[PDB]
């Protein structure tokens, strides 16, 4: 699991719901899904960069070709952040 990030290992469907559940468990709140940036859109090669805000503070933010996809990505990122992963992680002691 050195290179392999989560979601490759534990594959899932509908991360938004999961996030919501996790949020509830944690803070007793629900996330808004704002759209941070977008080049294209009508071009046929857009770059929708979509956030996820909780009480006017972004917990995560992800990219995508389409808006739904972007949202999904953001959700995934949020999940990763929650579950002590990310690309950063910590090296692990051997």
């Amino acid at each position: 699991m050195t290179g392999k990030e989560l979601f490759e290992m534990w594959k899932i469907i509908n991360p938004m719901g999961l996030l919501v559940e996790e949020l509830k468990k944690r803070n007793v709140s629900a996330p808004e899904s704002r759209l941070t940036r977008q080049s294209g859109g009508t071009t046929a090669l857009p770059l929708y960069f979509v956030g996820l805000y909780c009480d006017k503070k972004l917990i995560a933010e992800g990219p995508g070709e389409t808006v739904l996809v972007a949202e999904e990505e953001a959700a995934r990122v949020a999940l990763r952040k929650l579950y002590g992963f990310t690309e950063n992680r910590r090296p692990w002691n051997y």
């Binding site: 080049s39 071009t43 995508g64 990763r80």
Partner: protein, 177 residues
């Protein structure tokens, strides 16, 4: 970063649309920037093989300015195939015929001579006026600022500025002008 792989990759690449207003600017001073953008040399990801070029919208190209006497002096010169088909045209004339042309030519010259040049040119969007199409406007992200600063004529300077500036000499009270 976080992110899954493909989406990250997409984010890294993805063609951004940029805007340039002409109006009083020199072509080629526009084109330097535009050419760079087209190439994708403004990205730290740049390679000739990767295809990282962005879109450049340029507007108000009818309101280009030329430095010195280039409107009258600068000759754009091309051949048809045909004997006696050597056409030389002064920049002004060219502009009058097609206002998009001058900027475009400059951009072309700036770009590397490889086959990608024409593809790069297709990501260039030139307009003679403020009227850009709707799709293109939707696409746009950021205007990078104009090279030439615009000198500002006396009508625009306002009174306060004038007051601030000193009057350097006394005329004779008997002088007409």
């Amino acid at each position: 970063s976080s992110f899954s792989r493909a989406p990250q990759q997409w984010a890294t690449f993805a063609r951004i649309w940029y805007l340039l207003d002409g109006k009083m600017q020199p072509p080629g001073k526009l084109a330097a920037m535009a050419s760079i953008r087209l190439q994708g040399l403004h990205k730290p990801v740049y390679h000739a093989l990767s295809d990282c070029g962005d879109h450049v919208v340029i507007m108000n190209t009818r309101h280009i300015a030329f430095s010195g006497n280039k409107w009258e002096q600068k000759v754009y010169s091309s051949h048809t195939g045909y004997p006696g088909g050597f056409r030389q045209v002064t920049a002004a004339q060219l502009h009058l015929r097609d206002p998009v042309a001058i900027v475009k030519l400059a951009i072309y010259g700036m770009l590397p001579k490889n086959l990608h040049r024409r593809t790069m040119m297709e990501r260039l969007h030139l307009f003679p006026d403020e009227y850009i199409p709707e799709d293109i406007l939707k696409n746009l992200v950021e205007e990078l600022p104009q090279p030439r600063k615009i000198p500002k004529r006396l009508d625009e300077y306002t009174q306060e500025e004038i007051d601030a500036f000193p009057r350097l000499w006394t005329p004779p009270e008997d002088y007409r002008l």
